[PDB]
């Protein structure tokens, strides 16, 4: 019999059963989509959209749903911070139906339907269509089938770009401010000026899916008509489906790599309101720069919008997690409840010094309060050591602007040390671990999980591409 | 055999000397920006010339130069 790693070749020569297993795989994928979304809904906390967004909560598919329109729930709550109003009133206002549960229901229904179709095609494996006019051997023409599929996908891409994304006949897409404060699902208008190639401006996406959509339609039509060339036909062995497998696997690996690049570096497709902040916004001091400029712009400290300060916590970085630290981030440092306010430190002489923030790399950092001029003023010496620049020997008070500890001044050395460590961890915050038994060690957001999993997938699928290209080119030998 | 010996004798030492003089005449330091042994620091310029900006790196080195 066949070796355990070749069992599925029994559908290589059978177009009907090959289609059947593809349909079964599609049924599985749609069923997983539905079930995963259902689970995420069943473990969600809509109360807090600010200090407990979906990315803090270990959601995986909810941000992908929310990216292109789905925001509310039949139970009422929206993710944008307002109970959903049934603004729908008419046909073309299915928006009240396509909430999270509507999408789940449709996906489960598709799973069932595809499973039934797969069973049917498995049983009726010998339909006449698979066979040519006068030869018992089933034989399909892959180039024209590719043309048909490409034309279908081009139509759907053009429709997605022009109707759904523009908001003409669809919800539009998620857009936001440069600091993840206001998040709308609004339509976008396409522009062919060069700034549509900016990856962070959403106007490109529409402009892409329109133009590229048309490009596929033409590309479909050509392949639906044009025949291959003897040269290419013999070189690539277009009569053998294995070549299609090889090329598709390579394409999918490339797609995975590009997606990982966008997810890790951020783009208009991945907004920080949904997937959380990147690891470079912490490195470049993006939010700290913005806040410091805003306060410096005359606004008082308590008037700083709490999302903008939550983004400045280092526990939000996707580069502070672990491979086997499982679960949502709130299983880690715990769930946030309140921002203690911006702290400032002073020494005996009254000089204003600052704590150096821990970079992404270090799992632990040495707490060092330094003069703004670059001279170290005080510190916390190693676990038990005798010092000359120390916390107590020099004495340090801390005063908090805004937040829960407003106007307060802790000069108790343990308190100053605790808040020094908090300050080197970004912004001090009120974290609860009693609810979840959180472990205090961080975890990565949704963005990190995406990047890791699909970088691994792309790396493996490249080897798959090489193996299947080898078995295509060397077909006469591999038998 | 014999013929190529003339060419290689005429040429190879010339190339060797070409490299030799390229180093000895100090041309390499200019070509590659490699500091002269006295150029690492001035008599007190013991600070390190590290680039801090991506966009204007060459000009910043020109300042460090």
């Amino acid at each position: 019999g066949l070796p355990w790693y070749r069992v599925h070749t029994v559908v290589l020569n059978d177009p009907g059963r090959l289609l059947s297993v593809h349909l079964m795989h599609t049924a599985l994928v749609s069923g997983w989509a539905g079930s995963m979304a259902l689970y995420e809904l069943a473990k969600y906390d809509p109360s807090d959209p600010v200090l407990n967004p979906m990315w803090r909560q270990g959601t995986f598919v909810m941000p992908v749903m929310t990216r292109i329109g789905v925001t509310h729930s039949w139970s009422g709550w929206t993710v944008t911070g307002e109970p959903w109003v049934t603004q729908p009133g008419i046909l073309g206002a299915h928006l009240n139906f396509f909430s999270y549960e509507g999408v789940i229901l449709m996906h489960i229904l598709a799973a069932g339907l595809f499973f039934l179709a797969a069973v049917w095609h498995w049983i009726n494996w010998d339909l006449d269509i698979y066979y040519p006019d006068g030869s018992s051997e089933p034989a399909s023409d892959w180039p024209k089938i590719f043309g048909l599929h490409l034309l279908t996908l081009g139509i759907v891409c053009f429709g997605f770009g022009s109707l759904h994304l523009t908001g003409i006949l669809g919800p539009g897409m998620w857009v936001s401010d440069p600091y993840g404060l206001t998040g709308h699902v609004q339509g976008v208008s396409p522009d062919w000026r060069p700034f549509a190639f900016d990856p962070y401006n959403p106007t490109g996406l529409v402009t892409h899916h329109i133009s590229a959509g048309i490009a596929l339609i033409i590309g479909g039509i050509f392949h639906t008509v044009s025949r291959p060339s003897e040269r290419l036909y013999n070189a690539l062995s277009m009569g053998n489906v294995e070549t299609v497998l090889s090329s598709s696997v390579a394409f999918v690996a490339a797609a995975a790599f590009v997606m990982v690049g966008t997810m890790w570096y951020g783009s208009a497709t991945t907004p920080i309101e949904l997937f959380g902040p990147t690891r470079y916004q912490w490195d470049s001091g993006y939010f700290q720069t913005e806040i410091q400029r805003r306060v410096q712009s005359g606004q008082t400290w308590d008037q700083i919008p709490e999302k903008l300060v939550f983004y400045d916590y280092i526990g939000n970085s996707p580069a502070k997690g672990g491979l086997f630290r499982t679960g949502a981030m709130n299983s880690g440092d715990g769930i946030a409840r309140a921002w203690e306010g911006h702290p400032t430190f002073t020494d005996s002489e009254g000089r204003e010094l600052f704590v150096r923030r821990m970079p992404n790399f270090f799992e632990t950092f040495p707490v060092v309060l330094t003069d703004k001029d670059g001279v170290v003023r005080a510190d916390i010496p190693f676990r038990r050591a005798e010092s000359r620049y120390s916390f107590e020997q020099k004495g340090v008070s801390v005063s908090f602007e805004g937040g829960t500890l407003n106007g307060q001044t802790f000069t108790d050395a343990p308190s100053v040390k605790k808040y020094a460590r908090k300050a080197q961890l970004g912004e001090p915050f009120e974290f609860d671990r009693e609810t979840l038994g959180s472990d205090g060690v961080f975890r990565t957001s949704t963005r990190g999980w995406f990047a890791f999993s699909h970088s691994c997938y792309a790396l493996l699928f490249f080897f798959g591409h090489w193996w299947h290209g080898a078995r295509t080119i060397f077909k006469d030998v591999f038998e | 055999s014999i013929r190529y010996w003339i060419i290689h004798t005429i040429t190879v030492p010339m190339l060797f000397l070409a490299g030799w003089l390229f180093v000895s005449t100090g041309l390499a330091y200019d070509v590659f920006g490699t500091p002269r042994p006295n150029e690492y620091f001035d008599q007190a310029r013991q600070g390190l010339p590290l680039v801090t900006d991506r966009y204007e790196g060459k000009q910043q080195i020109d300042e460090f130069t």
Partner: protein, 36 residues
């Protein structure tokens, strides 16, 4: 109408032992992290 393309699946004893060794060794290696 029967499908010609049906073929059985074979796995001899030696292959079973190799597979079980692979599985058990991987489980032993990764359990210390799964328990975290």
């Amino acid at each position: 109408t029967p499908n010609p393309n049906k073929q059985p699946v074979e796995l001899n004893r030696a292959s079973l032992f190799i597979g079980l060794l692979l599985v058990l060794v991987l489980a032993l290696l990764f359990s210390s992290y799964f328990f975290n």
